[PDB]
């Protein structure tokens, strides 16, 4: 009686739940992802997690419809975290418009979009996030905010070194952006 997945939503934590279209003709149900066959689930999710990684603006755009925008993988990441991490100002603003939860914390460390944009040193994204209204005071599972984490990474980057000198200017700008919110 499983015809296809025609929707999704997250449940509890790191756990998907899908809307089922039955062939035999009854009402659509919601089911725990583990109730249905793996390769059914896979063909549904795989496009999303592919696009998220390639930070593909338009794929994401059409895949949006009945899918939950904050669909989470097994580590509690959503496509917003991946795209923040890759620097796609666009994919961030797209997912933002669609209604993605800016303050989402993953479960392998408590990280958020901002922590990722700061971590992978993504100044433009950090700007977009603050501007779209992300909460900059949110803390990761070490208590560190996004800002503190830039500070912490910066400290440990070799100072009089011509090779890591690029990241240096990078981290500074991240910090410029965020501090302009606190002070």
């Amino acid at each position: 009686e499983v015809n296809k997945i025609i929707g999704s939503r997250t449940a509890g934590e790191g756990a998907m739940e899908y809307l089922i279209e039955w062939k035999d003709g009854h009402s659509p149900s919601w089911v725990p992802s583990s109730y249905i066959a793996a390769d059914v689930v896979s063909e549904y999710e795989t496009p999303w997690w592919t696009a998220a990684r390639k930070a593909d603006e338009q794929a994401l755009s059409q895949l949006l419809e009945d899918r939950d925008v904050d669909a989470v993988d097994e580590n509690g990441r959503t496509a917003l975290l991946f795209v923040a991490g890759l620097g796609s100002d666009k994919c961030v603003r797209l997912l933002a418009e669609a209604g993605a939860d800016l303050d989402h914390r993953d479960m392998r460390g408590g990280l958020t979009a901002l922590h990722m944009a700061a971590g992978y040193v993504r100044p433009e994204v950090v700007e977009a996030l603050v501007e779209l209204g992300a909460d900059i005071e949110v803390e990761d599972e070490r208590g560190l905010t996004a800002l503190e984490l830039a500070r912490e990474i910066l400290k440990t980057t070799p100072k009089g070194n011509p090779m890591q000198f690029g990241r240096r200017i990078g981290l500074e700008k991240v910090i410029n952006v965020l501090e302009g919110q606190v002070f």
Binding site: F82, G85, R108, L111, G119, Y120, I153, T156, R167
Partner: peptide
């Protein structure tokens, strides 16, 4: 951190 190292995602 392990140095400057930071790839919680896995992009390497």
């Amino acid at each position: 951190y392990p140095g400057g190292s930071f790839d919680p995602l896995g992009l390497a």
